Design a protein around this nucleic acid. Structure first.
Ligand SMILES: [Mg+2]
Ligand SMILES: [Mg+2]
Ligand SMILES: [Mg+2]
Ligand SMILES: [Mg+2]
Ligand SMILES: [Mg+2]
Ligand SMILES: [Mg+2]
Ligand SMILES: [Mg+2]
Ligand SMILES: [Mg+2]
Ligand SMILES: [Mg+2]
Ligand SMILES: [Mg+2]
Ligand SMILES: [Mg+2]
Ligand SMILES: [Mg+2]
Ligand SMILES: [Mg+2]
Ligand SMILES: [Mg+2]
Ligand SMILES: [Mg+2]
Ligand SMILES: [Mg+2]
Ligand SMILES: [Mg+2]
Ligand SMILES: [Mg+2]
Ligand SMILES: [Mg+2]
Ligand SMILES: [Mg+2]
Ligand SMILES: [Mg+2]
Ligand SMILES: [Mg+2]
Ligand SMILES: [Mg+2]
Ligand SMILES: [Mg+2]
Ligand SMILES: [Mg+2]
Ligand SMILES: [Mg+2]
Ligand SMILES: [Mg+2]
Ligand SMILES: [Mg+2]
Ligand SMILES: [Mg+2]
Ligand SMILES: [Mg+2]
Ligand SMILES: [Mg+2]
Ligand SMILES: [Mg+2]
Ligand SMILES: [Mg+2]
Ligand SMILES: [Mg+2]
Ligand SMILES: [Mg+2]
Ligand SMILES: [Mg+2]
Ligand SMILES: [Mg+2]
Ligand SMILES: [Mg+2]
Ligand SMILES: [Mg+2]
Ligand SMILES: [Mg+2]
Ligand SMILES: [Mg+2]
Ligand SMILES: [Mg+2]
Ligand SMILES: [Mg+2]
Ligand SMILES: [Mg+2]
Ligand SMILES: [Mg+2]
Ligand SMILES: [Mg+2]
Ligand SMILES: [Mg+2]
Ligand SMILES: [Mg+2]
Ligand SMILES: [Mg+2]
Ligand SMILES: [Mg+2]
Ligand SMILES: [Mg+2]
Ligand SMILES: [Mg+2]
Ligand SMILES: [Mg+2]
Ligand SMILES: [Mg+2]
Ligand SMILES: [Mg+2]
Ligand SMILES: [Mg+2]
Ligand SMILES: [Mg+2]
Ligand SMILES: [Mg+2]
Ligand SMILES: [Mg+2]
Ligand SMILES: [Mg+2]
Ligand SMILES: [Mg+2]
Ligand SMILES: [Mg+2]
Ligand SMILES: [Mg+2]
Ligand SMILES: [Mg+2]
Ligand SMILES: [Mg+2]
Ligand SMILES: [Mg+2]
Ligand SMILES: [Mg+2]
Ligand SMILES: [Mg+2]
Ligand SMILES: [Mg+2]
Ligand SMILES: [Mg+2]
Ligand SMILES: [Mg+2]
Ligand SMILES: [Mg+2]
Ligand SMILES: [Mg+2]
Ligand SMILES: [Mg+2]
Ligand SMILES: [Mg+2]
Ligand SMILES: [Mg+2]
Ligand SMILES: [Mg+2]
Ligand SMILES: [Mg+2]
Ligand SMILES: [Mg+2]
Ligand SMILES: [Mg+2]
Ligand SMILES: [Mg+2]
Ligand SMILES: [Mg+2]
Ligand SMILES: [Mg+2]
Lengths: 122, 80, 21, 86, 199
RNA sequence: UCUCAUGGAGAGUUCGAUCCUGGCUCAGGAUGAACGCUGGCGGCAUGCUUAACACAUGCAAGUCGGACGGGAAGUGGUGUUUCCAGUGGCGGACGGGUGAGUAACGCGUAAGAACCUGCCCUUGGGAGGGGAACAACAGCUGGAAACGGCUGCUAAUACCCCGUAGGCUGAGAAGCAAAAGGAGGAAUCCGCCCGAGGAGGGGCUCGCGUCUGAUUAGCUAGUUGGUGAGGUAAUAGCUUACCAAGGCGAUGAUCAGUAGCUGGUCCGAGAGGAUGAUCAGCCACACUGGGACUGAGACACGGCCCAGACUCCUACGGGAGGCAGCAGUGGGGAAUUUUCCGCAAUGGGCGAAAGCCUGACGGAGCAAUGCCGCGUGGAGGCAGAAGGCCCACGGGUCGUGAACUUCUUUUCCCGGAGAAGAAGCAAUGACGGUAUCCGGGGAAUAAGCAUCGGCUAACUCUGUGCCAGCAGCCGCGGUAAGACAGAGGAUGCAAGCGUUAUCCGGAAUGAUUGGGCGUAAAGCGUCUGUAGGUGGCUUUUUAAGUCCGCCGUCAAAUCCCAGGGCUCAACCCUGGACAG
């Protein structure tokens, strides 16, 4: 407000806080699943969601969502995780890229296939 | 010492030189004192600004072979 | 016998002798 | 360039003075002018200058780990001498 | 990088597009389901305008965008300068000179090295034509035959005053820069300029 | 109605509705990007951001026989000519890589005065007379090797002495100091020594500008100044002794934390925000620390010495080494290429020249990493037929779309010719028989990817039933789901299309331009007052701000304007300028 007051450095920005601290400034990271299990969604959304706990290369442990329908992942599997938030499940800030490393592609998905890591059918 | 030479500009396969007065120890495209001539083989384009050339040849700037013979064709060695 | 390091060696020895001078 | 005019804060030391120079600058963002004050070790042979003095400050070779400046007689200043009243 | 799809179709949705098709659309036969989207969002009006432009000249978007940057740069009325730029394309001039049936035709003509601009072969469609320029057919049997038949069998004498055509050798000549009234379509450039405020 | 302006968009979400304050979220740009699906071509660029973590192999700095003594290849022999270790000469201080350290005169800018300077110019004088060594070589000898040891031996542009010197010391008196020859038949050339200049390259000094933290408040004793002696190429607490008690600090000293800096790049309507890859300048570093030596120049990446850590070789006694040079291997990692060709061009080093060496550089190869161009056909095509899908069974729609008929051949294929880049004597081209040009076939060789509830362009049907799943936000999904999955259809982009990460925008949401504080977050409980900020009227002075003119500079490249060249564009080149 007062000029004299601004000249004392009274305007300072709020810095940009990341939504995915565990990645540490990366598009993806690789990790190993410590556990694979289901959680119930915050009400009123009832379902059973497929989440794994993944221990990363950057050392962290997180809880990543697994997309699509059904999966082959089990403990001591090596997967690739990416960012993005599942508004349902408290604390789950990361997905698991399908079709890479140890996660296979979703079976028999015909539409938007690149999002699930599936070949084109001939 | 001060040298009058070519610095290589333009692109891959198509090469175009400037003729420059620069200390002999700077890199081939490095910084210089004065820009003087312009040269180019493929367009057969060549020309020089002689007042500068002479003012540097006078303070003891040594040319490089190619340049030497460019100044020859343009008759700067006669005036000297 | 054939010795190749001109730069290093020769300059090192020269350095000794000149140093003593 | 232009030499720096100032006033003496400390005469106590020998062959030296400690000057304060005040300048105004247009602060980078907010466009108002500000007084920034800097101190200098000025070399003054003969120790002619006392505390409170208004002295012009000049540049020369290093005399010390600090004093680079020659203390010099006040350059031009408006006479505090009374003038006629027509 | 070219639109090889169904044309009539784009025409039903956009409007009238000369540089695409000479066949007037079917009655439209949508009068059965009577399906509409309701009306058009202001956004959809703008979008359809741009699309009109884009398909009339056979330009890709990423290209159109760069034309628009060139346009905002230029000192002058933006929509007008844009329309200039689009209308000076070699293939389009080749078309409006009746040297071609349609723009995909004209484009093909240019691609296959059948055209000359001032005694030199230009095979790229988007070559910008500048005033006082010679548009010739290459002197071979094929080139001449193409240009002759497509020029003669099409009657349209609408030549837009900046374009000269001369009879036996078939020398076309670009005289000057386009006028806003001589433009090759019914478009409010205003709408397109507006669509592009966000780039 | 002259002149300026080429620029500022919103939307959903608290409520039963409304208006507002306020956050979250979205639409746009940009990447040194990564991942998924898909992938025809060309043009110009780009390519270990993490571990300044380790390195197997090979190559990245030499040259001069016209300084010099030798011996080794030949030849018939010192007529010819080659190589070669050694002493000497210059060069290895440039070029190349990296960003760890550094909050500093390190960097940008603008000044200064006490300096240095090989090579290159310009100029003033010179080069007498002697002598002594040391490698090499020889002999003896020690070592697995690496590398040594004795005694002899020898040349020089290599060392030492004396004479002379427009210089140095000094108030002076005086004192003191130099040389080198090699070519050529001679002319002459390249050198050598001492001064005195020039330009360029370095060393210092200072104004200004140069991150976050007060839950970091006092810090500094060679520290701040003075003299005397030393020291440095030069000024200086640079050193040392004595004297004095200063210096810096709430306008943030010290301490902690992060960081190479700048031309620039990205974004912004602008004001300004974020950043510092390629490209160019400067700094700093070379396995981890410390020294110096040589030298015009180093405290020296491919030099020396020492200590340490680590790897290798060893016949066990000892040695060898430093990829953050070009390739390459392991390792870390989401992720970043060939153990390529060439000195032909430009630039360097040495040489009288011939020339030699250059992983600088010039080029190729690999990769849709990005930007730009082009293609995957063009014209005609009963309004008749198969099929998908929808349908109130009337018909609609995929769809002029295909099939089908002709034209064309960029690209593809098979043959031919075939550059400029090379510079003034010819010769000499890695790229490459590539770029381009002429012929012959033939629609022939080439379309995917997201989305379709609102923002947001694009809709129906079958399958599921709070399940399986979606989602950027609101939120969808319990029997007919325009929001899930499939189908058909549409829409957007297009050799790319999406998802994630990062930054600015929108955000007027840290507000100078541009907000607020009665009730929404927000006026100290109230005064007194120090620094600090602002402060009535009139005349004069001065000219620090302020304004106007002129000059210097703010490197080139980039951005902006005007032309020109690659068929166009990207990209390159010339010229010029507003800002500030
Ligand atoms: Mg944001
Ligand atoms: Mg030529
Ligand atoms: Mg393209
Ligand atoms: Mg489609
Ligand atoms: Mg072509
Ligand atoms: Mg915008
Ligand atoms: Mg409420
Ligand atoms: Mg509600
Ligand atoms: Mg608000
Ligand atoms: Mg975006
Ligand atoms: Mg692939
Ligand atoms: Mg690195
Ligand atoms: Mg090795
Ligand atoms: Mg070699
Ligand atoms: Mg010889
Ligand atoms: Mg030789
Ligand atoms: Mg010689
Ligand atoms: Mg002989
Ligand atoms: Mg030899
Ligand atoms: Mg170096
Ligand atoms: Mg270097
Ligand atoms: Mg490089
Ligand atoms: Mg400075
Ligand atoms: Mg400095
Ligand atoms: Mg400072
Ligand atoms: Mg020397
Ligand atoms: Mg003599
Ligand atoms: Mg003597
Ligand atoms: Mg001879
Ligand atoms: Mg002789
Ligand atoms: Mg900065
Ligand atoms: Mg002391
Ligand atoms: Mg650092
Ligand atoms: Mg703004
Ligand atoms: Mg790098
Ligand atoms: Mg660099
Ligand atoms: Mg290392
Ligand atoms: Mg020395
Ligand atoms: Mg150093
Ligand atoms: Mg070195
Ligand atoms: Mg090395
Ligand atoms: Mg390497
Ligand atoms: Mg690896
Ligand atoms: Mg790995
Ligand atoms: Mg090689
Ligand atoms: Mg060469
Ligand atoms: Mg050369
Ligand atoms: Mg030479
Ligand atoms: Mg290269
Ligand atoms: Mg390929
Ligand atoms: Mg490409
Ligand atoms: Mg390719
Ligand atoms: Mg990819
Ligand atoms: Mg890559
Ligand atoms: Mg067709
Ligand atoms: Mg043909
Ligand atoms: Mg020639
Ligand atoms: Mg052909
Ligand atoms: Mg809509
Ligand atoms: Mg969806
Ligand atoms: Mg998003
Ligand atoms: Mg129901
Ligand atoms: Mg049922
Ligand atoms: Mg249903
Ligand atoms: Mg039904
Ligand atoms: Mg669906
Ligand atoms: Mg479909
Ligand atoms: Mg803002
Ligand atoms: Mg304000
Ligand atoms: Mg407010
Ligand atoms: Mg309240
Ligand atoms: Mg309140
Ligand atoms: Mg109160
Ligand atoms: Mg209180
Ligand atoms: Mg008060
Ligand atoms: Mg007061
Ligand atoms: Mg006052
Ligand atoms: Mg007043
Ligand atoms: Mg500039
Ligand atoms: Mg232009
Ligand atoms: Mg052009
Ligand atoms: Mg320029
Ligand atoms: Mg200026």
């Amino acid at each position: 407000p007062t000029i004299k007051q601004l000249i004392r450095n009274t305007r300072q920005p709020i810095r940009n806080v990341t939504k995915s601290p565990a990645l540490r400034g990366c598009p993806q990271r690789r990790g190993t699943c410590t556990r694979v299990y289901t959680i119930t969604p915050k009400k009123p959304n009832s379902a059973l969601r497929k989440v794994a706990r993944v221990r990363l290369t950057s050392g962290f442990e997180i809880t990543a969502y697994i997309p699509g329908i059904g999966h082959n992942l089990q403990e001591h599997s090596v997967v690739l995780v990416r960012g993005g938030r599942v508004k349902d499940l408290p604390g789950v800030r990361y997905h698991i890229v399908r079709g890479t490393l140890d996660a296979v592609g979703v079976k028999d998905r015909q539409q938007g296939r690149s999002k699930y890591g599936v070949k084109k059918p001939k | 010492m001060v040298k009058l030479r070519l610095k290589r500009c333009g692109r891959k396969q198509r090469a175009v030189y400037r003729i420059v007065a620069i200390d002999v120890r700077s890199r081939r495209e490095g910084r210089d004192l004065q820009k003087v001539g312009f040269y180019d083989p493929i367009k057969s384009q060549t020309y020089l600004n002689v007042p500068a050339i002479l003012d540097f040849l006078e303070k003891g700037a040594q040319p490089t072979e190619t340049v030497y013979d460019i100044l020859k064709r343009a008759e700067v060695f006669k005036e000297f | 016998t054939l010795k190749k390091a001109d730069s290093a060696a020769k300059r090192t020895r020269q350095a000794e002798t000149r140093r003593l001078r | 360039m232009r030499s720096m005019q100032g006033k003496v804060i400390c005469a106590t030391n020998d062959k030296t003075v400690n000057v304060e120079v005040v300048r105004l600058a247009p602060h980078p963002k907010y466009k108002r002018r500000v007084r920034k004050k800097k101190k200098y070790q000025a070399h003054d042979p003969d120790n002619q200058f006392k505390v409170g003095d208004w002295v012009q400050l000049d540049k020369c070779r290093p005399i010390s780990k600090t004093k680079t400046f020659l203390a010099v007689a006040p350059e031009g200043r408006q006479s505090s001498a009374t003038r006629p009243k027509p | 990088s070219r639109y090889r799809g169904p044309r009539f179709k784009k025409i039903r949705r956009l409007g009238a597009l000369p540089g695409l098709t000479n066949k007037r659309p079917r009655a439209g036969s949508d009068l059965r389901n009577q399906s509409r989207s309701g009306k058009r969002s202001q956004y959809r009006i703008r979008l359809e305008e741009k699309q009109k432009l884009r398909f009339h000249y056979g330009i890709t978007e990423r290209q159109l965008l760069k034309y628009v940057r060139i346009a905002r740069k230029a000192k002058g009325s933006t929509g007008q300068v844009l329309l200039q730029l689009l209308e000076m394309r070699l293939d389009n001039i080749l078309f409006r000179l009746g040297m071609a049936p349609t723009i995909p035709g004209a484009r093909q003509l240019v691609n296959h090295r059948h055209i000359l601009v001032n005694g030199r072969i230009v095979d790229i469609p988007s070559y910008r034509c500048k005033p006082q320029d010679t548009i010739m057919a290459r002197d071979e049997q094929k080139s001449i035959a193409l240009i002759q038949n497509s020029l003669d069998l099409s009657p349209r004498e609408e030549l837009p005053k900046h374009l000269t055509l001369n009879p036996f050798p078939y020398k076309g000549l670009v005289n000057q820069i386009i006028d806003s009234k001589w433009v090759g379509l019914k478009i409010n450039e205003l709408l397109v300029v507006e669509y592009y405020s966000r780039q």
